Every structure is written in structure tokens, then in C-alpha cells.
Design a protein around this nucleic acid. Structure first.
Lengths: 174, 195, 49, 47
RNA sequence: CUCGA
DNA sequence: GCATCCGTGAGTCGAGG
DNA sequence: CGTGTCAGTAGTGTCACGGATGC
């Protein structure tokens, strides 16, 4: 009946009142983190609810089976996932903060590219700005501009050398 | 509950308070405080004045007090809690990640207990730890002893990013580091003019 | 399971305690599963029985 | 993005507002993979 | 942690 | 009605670990 | 995959001041 299902809940609350507080101390000595010890306690008592063989014999010490389950839980946490990560915290001192370099070299290159771009024909400029600035394919630019496939290949081939002419005329390093 | 369960309804934890806020008349409790405020003894009136200060704000503004109880917690974008790699091969992550990770770990375990129909003692003791975890994520150390990291160091919560001299306001908003600047030792120069 | 924002429970003065007229420690016993709290009671059914 | 806007409003964030901001739920507790440096799906760094 | 004004 | 206890705050900049 | 002879805290020398908290 309903009382038979409620007796199982009173049985779990009993082993809580006798073992949970002592098992928390045991996991606290093994890990050192109280928030982790609470996690080990809940998992250990959850496996006690799933193993009726350990809750069957009261004449056999069930506390020992709990300490061993908690021990084989804390030893599994101690493997690969903890191995790499657990070492540092950015909030903790002694860790270098991430930096990003300045955009000076990129801004100067962008300015020189924009100057050499202004000295190009509208066709060549609107083809290099659709191949490198928009990253389209050769046939994509051919479809957009309504021109031939080789027409895009030839315009790109010359406009690149036209930019090399303007850059080498201004002293841009190879 | 075993005897007169048909007559009353009770609960524990935070979901109970969520139900009390739902079963709460804002306007009635506000006017009830006003009736005490209009004519009352200062010993017991000052305690009703400050209560109206809290209740009247929820009444006028139009925002429900239910927001004080959370069904979902937001996660700050990763670049504000970055995880960097170390020159020794290992890694190092912000303490906010360990707090979010502990909330995720305990919330998924609670979902297991709810599915398995585990005893109410395990589910309730699990729900308590989820409360302490979110409490640690938002303000670790506010209630009780803080969640210590490796080496008994208190983990920095989300609110720690705004507190005091090291907080976001004083460290990065009232004062900043600037480009086009330098520093060196000073030396007296008599020949220099005042300008 | 729903959860409370610690800023409004533990932050002084307890904003939740001011809204529901509940004592701070009583609120502490409720949230962290130390005491049940009565949400509703059918007072008329109790009278008729 | 001009720099003249009058008021800065603050208020309680509804649990529905938290979902309105969120681009997805963080289900798994993992972070990344410690070889490929690729973040695990649905983790704290999910792409 | 240690030091400089 | 009052003693208790909790939470708040406690100069600025710079250098090497 | 399963676990079982008791199996037991860390860390401990600030302070002024105000007001919510509590017997």
C-alpha cells in the first residue's frame, strides 16, 4: 500500500541522519573542497538508494561501503578532466592576462591599399573588392557582374599587378 | 499531511516562497501598511514605514516581485570569463566558470533525482545545494563560508567584479590606462622658463 | 527547481522579509530546507469538519 | 552609435527576460577538449 | 609577495 | 522594548615575481 | 564493470560605526 512506499523514504532519511554528516567529513579530507564533498555525499547516498543489498543487512556495517564508494568516486574525479584544467585560475595572481596587439600595421596597410585602390578602374576595383574583400568565388563574381568566367580571371590578374605597380612606385616593401 | 492533508498546502525551499509571492495581494498589503502608518506608535510604526518603502515600489512600478525568485540564471559571455592556456601545457580558467560549472553539475543531478523518483530527502537536500550554488555564483561568501578554490582561496563571484577598488567601476571606469603617455624620473631645471 | 536571488534574501535589509513580513532567520530556515511553510489552508472546510 | 542618449534604466530581470537574452541553454558542464582546443557542444564555451 | 615617491 | 551582531568602509602611482 | 571488519573538520592578532536583527 502507500505505507510500504513511505517506509522506504523513512529508511533513507534514517541513513542520512546516521551517515551523511560523517561521510561529508570523509570526503572533505580527501578533496578539501566542501562544495565538492556535498556532491560526493549526494552521489554516494544515491547509490545506496539504488543498491538494496547494502541497505539489507543491518548486522553488516553499511558505513564502510559508503566510505569505499566515496573513495572510488574521488579517485575517478582525479583523472584526465581534472588533470589539465584544475591548475590555474585567471582571478588568481601569477597568471598573465591576455593581450591583443595594436592595429597600427594593419591600419597603415589598409590605408595604402585604399590609396592604390582609388587609382584603379571601376571594373578592376569592383572585382578585387568582390574577390578579396567579399571572398566570393570566380564564378560568383562572374554571375554578379554579368561577365564571363575568364573575364573575372583576367581583371583580377591585371588589377593585382596594377596594385603592385602603385605600391612599388610608393616604396612598399615586398 | 498524513491526517489533515486534504485541508492545507505546505512546501519547503524556494518554490514555496515563489508560491507565497504568487499568493500575495500587493495593493491590500500596501494599504494595510498605510492604515498602520496613518495612526500608529513610532515603536511599531517605523518598522511599518520601511516595509511600505519596499512594497510601494513593487506596486507603482508595475514589475512583479516574482523576479526575486529565478527559474533561469543567465550565463555571462565567455570572453568576460576567459580560459587561457599556459606555457606549461595546462590551462587556467576564471572562477566564474567553476561557479557556473558547479551550478550545472548540481542542476543536472537534480534532474536525475526528479526522473528517478528518488526519496524526498535526497531531492530536497539536492535542491538546497543548488540554492547555495547560485548563491555562490552571484555573491559567494555572502551567506556562510565562501566556496574555497584550490588553496583555500575564495572564488570571485559575479558581484565581486563590481565591488570596491578592484571592481569594474573604480578600476576600469573612474580611472583608465591611456595611450600617448609616459613616465620618467624628474630633475630640476633652473634654466627652464615657467611655461 | 526555482531559486532565490541571494541579493534580496541575505542582503540587508532582507527585501523578501520586508515584502512577506517574514523574519530573516525564518526565511533562512525556509529557503534552505530546514522548515516547511504553510502556503494555503482551506479554512472553511476545516470549520465544516 | 552617437553618444547622446538621455536615460539609463535598470530593473528586475524576469526569468522570461533571461530566456529572451539567451542564445541557447548550457546543458553540459564541460568546457573544451584538451587536445583539439575545440569547445564541446552545449558546454560553457559552446560555439 | 618585495620595493620606489 | 533594547542589547546583539552583522555588514560596511579603510590614499595614489610605479618596478620586478 | 563494482566497491563493503573502525576508518572523522580547516583555520584561528583589524576596527569604527550604524541599523536591522533578535530574546
Amino acid at each position: 500500500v502507500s505505507g510500504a512506499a513511505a517506509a522506504e523514504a523513512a529508511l533513507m532519511r534514517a541513513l542520512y541522519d546516521e551517515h551523511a554528516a560523517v561521510l561529508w567529513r570523509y570526503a572533505l579530507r580527501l578533496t578539501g573542497d566542501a562544495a565538492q564533498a556535498e556532491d560526493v555525499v549526494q552521489e554516494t547516498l544515491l547509490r545506496a538508494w539504488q543498491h538494496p543489498e547494502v541497505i539489507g543487512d543491518t548486522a553488516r556495517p553499511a558505513r564502510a561501503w559508503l566510505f569505499t564508494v566515496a573513495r572510488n568516486m574521488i579517485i575517478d574525479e582525479r583523472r584526465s578532466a581534472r588533470f589539465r584544467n584544475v591548475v590555474g585560475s585567471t582571478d588568481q595572481s601569477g597568471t598573465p592576462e591576455q593581450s591583443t596587439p595594436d592595429e597600427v600595421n594593419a591600419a597603415l596597410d589598409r590605408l595604402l591599399i585604399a590609396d592604390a585602390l582609388a587609382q584603379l578602374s571601376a571594373e578592376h576595383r569592383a572585382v578585387i573588392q568582390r574577390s578579396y574583400y567579399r571572398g566570393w568565388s570566380t564564378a560568383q563574381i562572374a554571375t554578379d557582374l554579368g561577365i564571363a568566367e575568364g573575364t573575372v580571371k583576367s581583371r583580377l590578374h591585371y588589377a593585382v599587378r596594377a596594385l603592385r605597380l602603385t605600391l612599388q612606385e610608393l616604396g612598399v616593401t615586398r | 499531511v498524513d491526517r489533515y492533508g486534504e485541508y492545507f498546502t505546505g512546501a519547503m525551499g524556494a518554490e514555496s516562497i515563489q508560491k507565497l509571492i504568487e499568493n500575495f495581494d500587493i495593493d491590500a498589503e500596501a494599504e494595510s501598511l498605510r492604515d498602520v502608518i496613518r495612526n500608529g506608535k513610532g515603536q511599531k510604526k517605523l518598522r511599518a514605514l520601511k516595509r511600505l518603502k519596499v512594497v510601494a515600489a513593487f506596486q507603482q512600478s508595475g514589475n512583479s516581485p516574482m523576479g526575486m525568485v529565478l527559474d533561469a540564471v543567465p550565463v555571462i559571455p565567455p570572453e568576460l570569463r576567459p580560459m587561457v592556456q599556459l606555457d606549461g601545457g595546462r590551462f587556467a580558467t576564471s572562477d566564474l566558470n567553476d561557479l557556473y560549472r558547479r551550478v550545472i553539475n548540481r542542476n543536472n543531478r537534480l534532474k536525475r533525482l526528479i526522473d528517478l523518483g528518488a526519496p524526498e530527502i535526497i531531492v530536497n537536500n539536492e535542491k538546497r545545494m543548488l540554492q547555495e550554488s547560485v548563491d555562490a555564483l552571484f555573491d559567494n561568501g555572502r551567506r556562510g563560508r565562501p566556496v574555497t578554490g584550490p588553496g583555500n582561496r575564495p572564488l570571485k563571484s559575479l558581484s565581486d567584479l563590481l565591488k570596491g577598488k578592484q571592481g569594474r567601476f573604480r578600476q576600469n571606469l573612474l580611472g583608465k590606462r591611456v595611450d600617448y603617455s609616459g613616465r620618467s624620473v624628474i630633475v630640476v631645471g633652473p634654466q627652464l622658463k615657467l611655461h | 527547481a526555482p531559486v532565490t536571488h541571494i541579493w534580496y534574501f541575505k542582503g540587508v535589509p532582507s527585501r523578501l522579509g520586508y515584502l512577506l513580513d517574514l523574519a530573516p532567520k525564518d526565511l533562512e530556515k525556509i529557503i534552505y530546507f530546514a522548515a516547511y511553510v504553510i502556503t494555503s489552508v482551506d479554512e472553511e472546510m476545516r470549520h465544516n469538519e | 552609435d552617437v553618444n547622446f542618449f538621455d536615460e539609463l534604466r535598470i530593473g528586475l530581470a524576469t526569468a522570461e527576460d533571461i530566456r529572451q537574452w539567451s542564445y541557447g541553454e548550457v546543458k553540459k558542464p564541460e568546457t573544451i577538449n584538451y587536445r583539439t582546443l575545440k569547445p564541446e557542444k552545449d558546454g560553457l564555451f559552446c560555439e
